[PDB]
Amino acid sequence: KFEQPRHGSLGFLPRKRASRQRGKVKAFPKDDASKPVHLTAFLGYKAGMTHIVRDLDRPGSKMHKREILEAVTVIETPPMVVVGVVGYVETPRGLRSLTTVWAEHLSEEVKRRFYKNWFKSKKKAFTKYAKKYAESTQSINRELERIKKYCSVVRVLAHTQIRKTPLAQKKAHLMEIQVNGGSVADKVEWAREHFEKTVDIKSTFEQNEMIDVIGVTRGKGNEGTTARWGTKRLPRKTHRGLRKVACIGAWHPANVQWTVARAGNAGYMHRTQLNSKIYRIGAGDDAKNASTDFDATEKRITPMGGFVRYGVVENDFVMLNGATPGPVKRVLTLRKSLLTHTSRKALEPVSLKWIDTASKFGHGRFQTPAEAKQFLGTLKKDVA
Amino acid sequence: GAASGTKYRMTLGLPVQAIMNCADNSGAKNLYIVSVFGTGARLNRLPAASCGDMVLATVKKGKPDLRKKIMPAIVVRQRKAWRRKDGVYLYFEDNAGVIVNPKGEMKGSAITGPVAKECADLWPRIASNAGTVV
Amino acid sequence: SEFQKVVVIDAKGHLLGRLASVVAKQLLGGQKVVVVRCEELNISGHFFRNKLKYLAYLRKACRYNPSRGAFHFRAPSRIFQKAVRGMLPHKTARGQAALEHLQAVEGIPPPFDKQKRVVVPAALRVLRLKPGRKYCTVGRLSSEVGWKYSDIVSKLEERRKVKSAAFYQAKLAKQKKIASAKAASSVNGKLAEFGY
RNA sequence: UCAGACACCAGAAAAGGUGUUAGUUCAUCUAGACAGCAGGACGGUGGCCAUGGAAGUCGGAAUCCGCUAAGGAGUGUGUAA
RNA sequence: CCAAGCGUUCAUAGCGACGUUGCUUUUUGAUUCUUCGAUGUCGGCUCUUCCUAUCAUACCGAAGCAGAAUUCGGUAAGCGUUGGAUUGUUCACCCACUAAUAGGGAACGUGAGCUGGGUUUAGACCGUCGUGAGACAGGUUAGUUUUACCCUACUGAUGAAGU
RNA sequence: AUGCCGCGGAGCUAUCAUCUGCCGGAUAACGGCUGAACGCCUCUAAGCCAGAAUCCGUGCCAGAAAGCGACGAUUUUUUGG
Ligand SMILES: [Mg+2]
Ligand SMILES: [Mg+2]
Ligand SMILES: [Mg+2]
């Protein structure tokens, strides 16, 4: 009596710690053979958040042709390197990996992924495989041919160039990225040609595209039911504590039910958030990364003082609208959308008017070093 | 409902039992919020109002004729800061409303003090009697 | 009089429970059994009634922890395996060992498509069901309760049938040459007087 | 689309079913049964009150003759009646 | 189920007596089979789940121009079912909002979960009763709410290897 | 026993802040098609469509610690392999 909806979703169970950190693509987009060959996912690094001003183009809206302010998330996306290919055969027990073909040479950062102590090891990871590649170059072609004959699904092995980021970790992140497009033979040919080659973010995604972001959320440790599940605080008078659930079950079933809120792990969980819109695909080689057609000031996408706990973004980046799972510097998986988008909100072209680059280490008031120097004039340190 | 269109979500500042100034010359001074129109169902949650919202109120201080009865009113100012779609967080010095009939027509004829833009766009009778808007 | 080590049964066209009871008894006698093409099994009764029976089965879950609950397998060979397990004393070692001597599969995977496949006449639909009695196929029931592999099994079965037809054609030709060289033999007369 | 499955016993009723099977009665039946079915359905009479018109085919009260295979003051379609 | 009838006219649009066949009861009662070397006792709060006898939401059917309003009518419990004044309360009525403010079960769900307003018979006052000690289809006020460190369950956390 | 007051980065946090939250299949009620029996009629007799917030899936979470696959390197000139 006095009904209320249950607290939290039974679809996100169990609330254990994720068995991974990277962020796993659970489902790739349906393959269309009529399209050209392309990648369906990319790996980036969460650099930080800022906000933009843009003019809204939404007829029928009170804010049509008016300025809106929006929080955005900046993900640093240097080009990934294709290092291999995996073929999967359709079977009555699911997809099965038939075989995996690697590039002749693998860089050190990807080879660090195969070790817990790369430095102390003998660095013997693909040394015998590499010799096979340069003996006759015939077992490589045979393995690729078998993927063409069998293997309805083809995925490239691609790794990040984490050394180009300011991260202290040297071990690169490696993932299977499904190749969608025309024909299994063309997938394998495309993959072989990209061995040891870079694929960059603008060849995967485009401006205004709607994508999904997959990552592991911020760790929270344990939490009681009040914060883990949102249960009501018990009264001040409650003996033996109030941050709990008063009644965790009836008589009969003489057992605690799985649907009752319990204290436990409250973070570090795997989530795929849908419908993040790409507001900008920045280029790491141009000094007007954060400039607009209305803000001509030559500035890049790094706030004053650098991204807090990240550093300077010197590579390509994406400027998704809103929030993403996980903390600054966690690797995030960007995936092509499984849905079709025809709504006006999804289809509207996005043209930014201004990107904030003030310090996020406080109440920063200057967008650029030059603006700070002009407003304040000269200081005791500036003169000498 | 059927004011002039729609209103964006605004931080609610005036729950039930809140008392706000009467910003009009209807003879009232002390609107006491009893209910908020459009409030759905949520256990233990108090109905609460923001600027532009129609509420039901009683008059606690003012002309004896206006008291002891429930009347509609519109919130025109609030102290809790809310966020405009252009990213501005704004707030007023006080909480005020004006007595209206269900259609939204003002019982009084003049409004003292500023009036929120959200209230003005929704209710043209309030906009006609408003002085400075925002 | 079938005491062979392993028998492979083509489940196509057999009635679920009647085949299940025969197989279960054979397992308890120490026979290794392979049941192939479990998607082609039949159950008597119209489709809707049999679908409702599985849906009622799917409701039965442990109230306080469904991960303990009855585990409802959707694939056709798992539906058959459940029928066989119910006819074995599976909570004893003897029943468990009997159940482990069964291998039920969808389609005809590569170990068994080059082996002889037999049928069980006591369980054949055409012999047991009156004509005009409605019946359903297990593969269709499975596909509407969550089984995902109707299409890949069907495609692989068409490919297997093409190869088997080629194998059969080659064997037909070889047997014809042997039979011609047999009926022309002079020793046929003395074999006739013996019934051969 | 809730089958049923064995005494005690662990549920059941009234009443119903173009369910299904099987059997009974009145009786239309080579004097041409039913459905399919071609037809006819004369005049008194447009029966008395009813009314702007109401001739069966919108109402009140009543149900007859000569002949014929066939005729009753009527089932209607539509008709401004 | 029956059909005398209301329903200008049509016995069953919607109403529908006398009878008759069933379901349920959360009603006290009936009984006394379990418990008197002891199963904590109302309500509220909190929290979960189940049933459908459907208030709202989805799709359908019938009566008459639409417009609606009723039969929520038939499927259907997926998803909702509120804020207050009061009642110790259950119930209930009232002010409102709301798409709507449906009814039930879970040891009359839920006290090593709380709270303790109810009950709470030790202190005390009153009314009626009693010669009195004292009593009560009553009223009133004050009155200690213990323990998990075991097993399981549940929530999270590690983890051996013959293959 | 943080003496008190203003501001206070970082972090944490707010329905006091911002972001994001699909479409496939089978059905129920109920409605049509081909068509009978009961020579006509009629959604039913077999069947074929259409059809609900229903059900089952894809999608999302876990991942069998006794379900599984692909791949890499295999104690190094001591000693083990
Ligand atoms: Mg206490
Ligand atoms: Mg900051
Ligand atoms: Mg409450």
3-state secondary structure A129-154: HHHHHCCCCCHHHHHHHHHHHCCCEE
Q: Is the CB atom of residue A243 positioned under 7 angstroms from any atom of strand E?
A: no
- Report the DSSP beta bridge partners of residue A90: A95
CA A305, distance to chain mean position in Å, is 24
> How many A from CA of A360 to the centre of ligand 2?
4
**Residue carrying the six token digits 């080689």:** A285
For B22, the enclosing helix (H) or strand (E) is: strand B19-22
The C-alpha angle with vertex A190 and arms to A185 and A196, in degrees rounded to 5, equals: 135
How many Å from the N-terminal Cα to the C-terminal Cα in chain A? 76
* Per-domain residue ranges of chain B: 1-134
Query: What is the C-alpha separation between B36 and B73, in angstroms, rounded?
Result: 10
| E strand or H helix that includes residue B30 | strand B30-36
Q: In terms of DSSP H, where are the helices of chain C?
A: 16-28, 47-59, 76-85, 93-100, 125-128, 138-143, 150-183, 188-192
Q: Is the CB of A11 under 7 A from strand F?
A: yes
Q: How was this structure determined?
A: cryo-EM
Closest CA to C116 of C2, C14, C22, C6: C6
- Residue C5: partners with Cβ closer than 8 Å, 6 or more residues away: C31, C32
Among residues A242, A261, A363, the alpha carbon closest in space to that of A6 is found at A261
Look up residue A325 and give its two tokens: 């799972």
Q: CB distance A69–B8 less than 8 Å?
A: no
Between CA A165 and CA A306 the distance in angstroms is 13
From residue A330, give the alpha-carbon distance in Å to each of A23, A44, A45, C70. Answer: 10, 9, 6, 39
C161 touches strand F (CB under 7 A): no
Q: Which of B4, B45, B85, B121 to mutate to test the interface with A (most CBs of A within 10 A)?
A: B85
Between strands C32-36 and B89-90, the pairing is unpaired
Distance in angstroms between the alpha carbons of the first and the last residue of chain B: 23
Question: C16-28 and C76-85 are packed helices; what angle lies between their axes, rounded to 10 degrees?
Answer: 60
Query: A319: Cβ under 7 Å from strand E?
Result: no
Give the whole-angstrom CA distance, residue B78 versus residue B59: 18
Look up tokens 């269109």; give the residue: B5
Q: Which residues in chain C are closer than 8 Å to A90, comparing Cβ atoms?
A: 152
The CA-based dihedral angle spanning residues C105, C109, C115, C116, taken in that order and rounded to the nearest 10 degrees: 50
A324, closest nucleotide (Cα–C1'):
F19
A66: which 2 tokens?
Answer: 């008016």
What is the β-pairing status of strands A210-216 and A270-282?
A: antiparallel
Cis peptide before B114 (omega within 30 of 0): no
Query: Radius of gyration over alpha carbons of chain A, in Å?
Result: 25
Q: What DSSP letter does each residue of A143-199 carry, written as one string? A: HHHHHHHS-SEEEEEEE--GGGSS-S--SPPEEEEEEESS-HHHHHHHHHHTTTEEE
H runs (alpha helix) in A210-320: 225-228
Rounded Cα–Cα distance for residues B2 and B48 (Å): 19
If you ran DSSP here, which 8-state letter would residue A35 be given? Answer: S
Which chains touch C (3+ CB pairs under 8 A)? A
One-letter amino acid for residue C161 of the chain: K
Per residue, the 3-state secondary structure of A315-354, as one string, reads CCEEEEECCCCCCCCCEEEEEECCCCCCCHHHHCCCCEEE
Distance of CA A81 to the CA centre of its chain: 17
Q: Resolution for this model in angstroms, one decimal place?
A: 1.9
| C-alpha–C-alpha distance, residues A142 and A144, integer Å | 5
Which nucleotide comes closest to A3 if you measure CA to C1'? E81
